[PDB]
Design a binder for this molecule. Structure first.
Ligand SMILES: CC(=O)N[C@H]1[C@@H](OP(=O)(O)O)O[C@H](CO)[C@@H](O)[C@@H]1O
Ligand SMILES: OCCc1ccc(O)cc1
Ligand SMILES: OCCc1ccc(O)cc1
Ligand SMILES: [Mg+2]
Length: 473
């Protein structure tokens, strides 16, 4: 294990930093436990922890308008000829092996109450497919469509960001499913980083006598993680130029959506993002807007209930701020090549939490009654203000085709397994109907390997399908 000299130098650092309590139980640790504590403490800089705690617990003490029209767009307002062109252009970029996907799948799904990673969840479709599998098959299908135009292999590498709680069960799940028919060599599971949890008094919390309480560093942890994992280097080696980044929990996510990629690429933006119309004042969504001349987002946990209810001057029964973030982002690869210059600039969001820890005295593991500390998180959209308005685009899409998050346990009424299932099977039915199918009957599941977004269903014209149904290969 670590030498006595190594250990004393670490202890000095932490003690000088006012964090020497992390060594309170060293004298009763086994060799292994002492080794773990040494290595874990060595991974943090206690002076930086003090910097973070200070900014969080003693923060320094609203030019806030809707995004201007130059930076916004809407599928509803689009010329269908342009939609067709951007689709074709996106598919051509996929065919050129220029498109990558980053999946943010490090969330714990604590509102959901599942023991498995959220992506593994079965929302009760006829197929019993997981969110992960549905997403993988969307990638597979787009590759197939792209190969029809190129006559060459089309690959969309899938970079799956997990946390400590999610990584091993995620990798096992992918292996057990043989990567859902994608090539293992083009799917990379990597981990985001963590930050120490900090007490209300600014002290590192000890989960045990030999372990610091940590949490994942928020989805804004993506950027630093792309470097350390080797993912950015892999994207460079493959000639990636366009990246779609999204959240695992959206059962309708149009993975590597070619219209979105084609549109972004055509406008030559650094960053593009999708929104839907906020469904009410209390919806738990970030709001995309202009702050101090800059594109920005106000998260639902940080907005004041006055700006959430701010009504349109012209239309007093409609909300001023209603561009709901659906966690569907486009980046240029050039944007990723500059991460090192601004990753440190991202703010740390503060959440007060009940962090299980050791009774600072006994050493007994105790679940606190009231919030005893804070967790720090970076948010993926806090890059938006680094980007000029002219290199940013915010597009409205249709909720019922694009956004159906799995947030809550079954039996909630909203953003749960039942709404997810309903939205998927309603989507399938609408596509079949538009293609001339007659659905008797609620809804029909259409496999992504049959249809990515409504195409390829001509074979169903005139046919009668008894709902509920599952259309597959
Ligand atoms: C940091 C981040 O990405 N937050 C997102 C994300 O919130 P969650 O706290 O992860 O549920 O998903 C929302 C959509 O479901 C979106 O509106 C919000 O801004
Ligand atoms: O990079 C994470 C640091 C770390 C090292 C060893 C541990 O046992 C725990 C955490
Ligand atoms: O003008 C809006 C075109 C557009 C439509 C849908 C997308 O997903 C992206 C861009
Ligand atoms: Mg792999």
């Amino acid at each position: 294990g670590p030498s006595a000299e190594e250990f004393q130098q670490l202890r000095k650092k932490y003690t000088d930093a006012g964090q020497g309590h992390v060594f309170a139980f060293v004298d009763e640790l086994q060799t292994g436990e002492r080794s773990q504590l040494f290595h874990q403490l060595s991974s943090f800089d206690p002076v930086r922890i003090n910097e973070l705690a200070d900014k969080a617990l003693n923060p320094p003490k609203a030019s806030l308008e809707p995004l201007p029209d130059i930076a916004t767009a809407s599928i509803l307002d689009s010329d269908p000829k342009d939609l067709e062109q951007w689709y074709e252009e996106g598919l051509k970029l996929v065919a050129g092996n220029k498109v990558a996907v980053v999946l943010m799948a490090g969330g714990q799904g604590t509102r959901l109450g599942s023991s498995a990673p959220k992506g593994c969840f079965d929302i009760g479709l006829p197929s019993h497919k997981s969110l992960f599998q549905i997403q993988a098959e969307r990638i597979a299908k787009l590759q197939l469509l792209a190969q029809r135009i190129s006559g060459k292999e089309a690959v969309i590498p899938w970079y799956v960001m997990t946390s400590g709680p999610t990584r091993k069960p995620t990798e096992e799940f992918f292996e057990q499913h043989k990567y859902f028919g994608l090539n293992k060599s083009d799917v990379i599971i990597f981990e985001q980083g963590v930050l120490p949890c900090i007490s209300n008094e600014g002290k590192i919390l000890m989960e045990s006598k030999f372990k610091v309480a940590v949490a994942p560093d928020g989805n804004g942890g993506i950027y630093q993680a792309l470097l350390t994992s080797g993912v950015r280097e892999d994207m460079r080696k493959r000639g990636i130029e366009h990246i779609h980044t999204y959240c695992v929990d959206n059962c309708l996510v149009k993975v590597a959506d070619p219209v979105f990629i084609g549109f972004a690429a055509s406008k030559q933006v650094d960053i593009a993002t999708k929104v839907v119309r906020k469904r009410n004042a209390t919806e738990s969504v970030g709001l995309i807007l202009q702050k101090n001349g800059k594109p920005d987002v106000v998260e639902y946990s940080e907005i004041d209930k006055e700006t959430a209810e701010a009504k349109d001057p012209k239309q007093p029964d409609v909300l001023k701020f209603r561009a709901a973030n659906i966690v569907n982002h486009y980046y240029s690869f050039k944007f990723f090549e500059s991460i090192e210059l601004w990753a440190h600039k991202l703010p740390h969001h503060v959440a007060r939490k009940k962090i299980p820890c050791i009774k600072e005295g006994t050493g007994e593991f105790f679940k606190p009654e009231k919030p005893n500390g804070i967790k720090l998180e970076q948010f993926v959209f806090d890059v938006f203000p680094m980007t000029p308005l002219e290199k940013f685009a915010c597009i409205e899409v249709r909720r019922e085709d694009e956004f159906s998050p799995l947030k809550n346990a079954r039996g909630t009424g909203e953003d749960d397994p039942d709404t997810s299932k309903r939205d998927i099977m309603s989507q399938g039915q609408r596509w079949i109907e538009k293609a001339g199918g007659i659905v008797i009957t609620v809804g029909v599941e259409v496999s992504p390997l049959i249809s990515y977004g409504g195409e390829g269903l001509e074979f169903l014209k005139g046919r009668e399908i008894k709902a509920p149904a599952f259309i597959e290969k």
